Amino acid sequence: SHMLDGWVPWPESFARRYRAAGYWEGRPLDRLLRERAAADPDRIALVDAAGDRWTYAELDRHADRQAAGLRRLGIGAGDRVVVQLPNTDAFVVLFFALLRAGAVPVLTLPAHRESEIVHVAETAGATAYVIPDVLDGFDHRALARAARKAVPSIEHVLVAGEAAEFTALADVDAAPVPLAEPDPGDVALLLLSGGTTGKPKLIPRTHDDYTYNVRASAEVCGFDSDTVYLVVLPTAHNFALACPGLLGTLMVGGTVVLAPTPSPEDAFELIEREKVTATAVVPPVALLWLDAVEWEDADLSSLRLLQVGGSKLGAEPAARVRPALGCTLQQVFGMAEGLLNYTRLDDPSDLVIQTQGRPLSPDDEIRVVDEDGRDVAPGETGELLTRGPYTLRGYYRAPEHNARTFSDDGFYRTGDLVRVLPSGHLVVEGRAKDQINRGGDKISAEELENHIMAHPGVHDAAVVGMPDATMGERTCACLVPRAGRSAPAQRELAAFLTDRGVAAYKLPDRVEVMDAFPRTSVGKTDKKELGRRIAG
Numbered sequence: 288s289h290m291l292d293g294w295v296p297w298p299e300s301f302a303r304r305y306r307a308a309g310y311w312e313g314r315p316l317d318r319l320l321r322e323r324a325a326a327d328p329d330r331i332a333l334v335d336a337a338g339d340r341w342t343y344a345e346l347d348r349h350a351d352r353q354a355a356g357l358r359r360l361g362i363g364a365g366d367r368v369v370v371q372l373p374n375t376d377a378f379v380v381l382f383f384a385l386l387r388a389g390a391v392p393v394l395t396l397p398a399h400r401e402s403e404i405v406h407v408a409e410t411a412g413a414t415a416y417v418i419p420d421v422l423d424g425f426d427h428r429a430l431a432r433a434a435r436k437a438v439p440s441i442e443h444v445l446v447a448g449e450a451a452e453f454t455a456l457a458d459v460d461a462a463p464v465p466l467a468e469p470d471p472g473d474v475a476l477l478l479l480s481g482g483t484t485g486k487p488k489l490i491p492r493t494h495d496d497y498t499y500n501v502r503a504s505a506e507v508c509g510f511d512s513d514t515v516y517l518v519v520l521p522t523a524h525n526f527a528l529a530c531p532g533l534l535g536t537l538m539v540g541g542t543v544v545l546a547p548t549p550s551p552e553d554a555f556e557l558i559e560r561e562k563v564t565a566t567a568v569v570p571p572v573a574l575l576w577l578d579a580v581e582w583e584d585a586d587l588s589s590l591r592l593l594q595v596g597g598s599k600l601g602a603e604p605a606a607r608v609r610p611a612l613g614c615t616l617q618q619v620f621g622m623a624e625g626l627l628n629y630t631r632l633d634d635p636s637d638l639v640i641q642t643q644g645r646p647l648s649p650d651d652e653i654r655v656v657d658e659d660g661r662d663v664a665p666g667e668t669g670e671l672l673t674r675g676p677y678t679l680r681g682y683y684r685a686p687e688h689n690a691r692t693f694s695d696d697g698f699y700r701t702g703d704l705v706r707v708l709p710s711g712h713l714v715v716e717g718r719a720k721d722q723i724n725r726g727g728d729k730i731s732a733e734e735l736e737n738h739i740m741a742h743p744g745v746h747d748a749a750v751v752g753m754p755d756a757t758m759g760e761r762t763c764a765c766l767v768p769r770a771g772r773s774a775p776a777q778r779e780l781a782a783f784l785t786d787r788g789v790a791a792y793k794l795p796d797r798v799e800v801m802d803a804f805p806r807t808s809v810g811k812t813d814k815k816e817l818g819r820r821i822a823g
């Protein structure tokens with residue numbers, strides 16, 4: 288019996304093995320804060336960008352008070368709550384408050400707009416939505432009004448800021464009350480993945496598997512009480528939340544420092560001010576920092592570990608991390624779906640430079656298969672399939688996609704092309720899935736194509752990635768105009784998509800108009816050949 292329907296538990300035989308091996312320790316996710324605050328109440332747990340500071344005991348207490356306030360609003364056992372918050376202390380307190388109230392956080396990113404927010408709120412049956420007031424020039428309260436009109440289940444809107452007609456998140460506060468613990472085998476939170484289909488996909492992560500994700504990651508990355516971790520990616524990004532991220536920092540009793548942006552202006556100042564020892568970035572930010580040290584005078588000497596993931600960091604900039612930034616590079620090839628690959632901190636520099644790591648868990652199982660589904664010869668390139676103690680067995684409430692995406696024996700088809708080396712380290716070679724990786728941001732081609740085809744000048748759309756030296760990939764929208772109509776150019780299409788509620792990282796970089804798309808002999812649109820026609 289599980290508190291949530293719509294997800295796919297592990298087979299009992301696997302669950303027994305993972306419990307027996309010590310992976311699944313049977314503790315709710317919120318206990319990592321409860322346990323740390325009991326052992327080290329007066330250690331500094333959290334610093335925000337302004338320099339305000341909270342101890343473990345203060346964070347634990349505030350989470351209890353906000354959990355009690357949430358229950359007063361009717362937000363509790365099993366309710367899904369969409370969270371869209373910046374890198375501020377509000378998110379950290381609310382994350383644990385929701386867990387302790389029994390609610391299931393549905394984590395979205397500040398960039399997400401009406402299309403993504405409405406879909407995930409509709410899918411999850413969310414009863415509440417948590418937003419800032421204004422962030423990076425955008426009034427999320429307007430977006431909350433749109434989401435409520437489209438999703439009747441949303442009863443409460445909690446605002447980190449000026450609440451307007453809604454509820455101020457700060458007022459969600461009450462005297463702590465005894466709350467029952469959740470079953471550790473139940474879903475603790477839902478993550479978002481760009482995915483490959485027409486709608487974003489939600490990833491259920493259980494208390495046991497996410498705690499293991501956090502704990503094992505902290506071990507591999509040498510996180511402990513003298514770690515000062517800078518949250519540069521969004522707090523809701525799996526990489527910065529749990530790999531080991533802020534949760535791993537709190538679990539071991541280090542200090543979490545929240546960066547408001549990844550710019551050197553903000554990040555370098557915080558690294559010097561707070562003596563940051565570890566952080567995690569995507570390659571475009573790594574390149575920016577590697578450049579910026581040549582004209583910034585910040586003292587970054589405290590930095591010991593720079594994790595780089597989300598897309599493949601090239602060997603040439605990888606080699607520059609130690610000379611330029613004075614720290615150890617760790618390549619991380621991970622996914623919200625589960626499987627994490629890490630270079631080890633004392634790997635030879637050759638493997639840190641040239642590979643994307645090896646799996647976190649001894650019981651991470653990996654297969655590399657050809658087009659016919661057969662295992663490749665050792666060292667050959669094929670598609671990575673994986674199964675393990677923190678990799679999902681299905682997306683949330685997506686049975687049709689699950690039937691296509693997981694093999695019969697439960698292997699998740701990642702859509703990544705990889706080689707496995709004799710040491711077990713992986714090299715990322717490309718992608719099989721129809722999803723563009725734009726500076727770390729994942730763009731489902733099918734979803735974007737459906738949005739674009741809603742434009743009155745478009746009959747058909749095919750979204751193709753184009754290589755980019757610093758972004759990895761950019762997005763080209765190939766358009767067949769509607770009969771007797773002119774297709775839009777890039778700027779009009781961008782405006783149409785933004786008004787439609789499409790996140791800004793999905794706006795096509797380039798538009799190419801054409802009377803027809805190349806097709807295979809099936810005949811699906813041949814995006815291999817579209818890439819060539821784009822290039823001439």
Ligand SMILES: Nc1ncnc2c1ncn2[C@@H]1O[C@H](COP(=O)(O)O)[C@@H](O)[C@H]1O
Nearest residue numbers: 596597598599619620621622623715729
């Ligand atoms: N170090 C890395 N190198 C290459 N690709 C990566 C890396 N880290 C993450 N990814 C990509 O990000 C995907 C996971 O993100 P998502 O599908 O949004 O959960 C992987 O399947 C890869 O395509």
Ligand SMILES: O=C(O)c1ccccc1O
Nearest residue numbers: 525526596597621622623
């Ligand atoms: O989703 C990702 O891109 C990712 C990258 C590195 C580590 C964990 C992750 O979820």
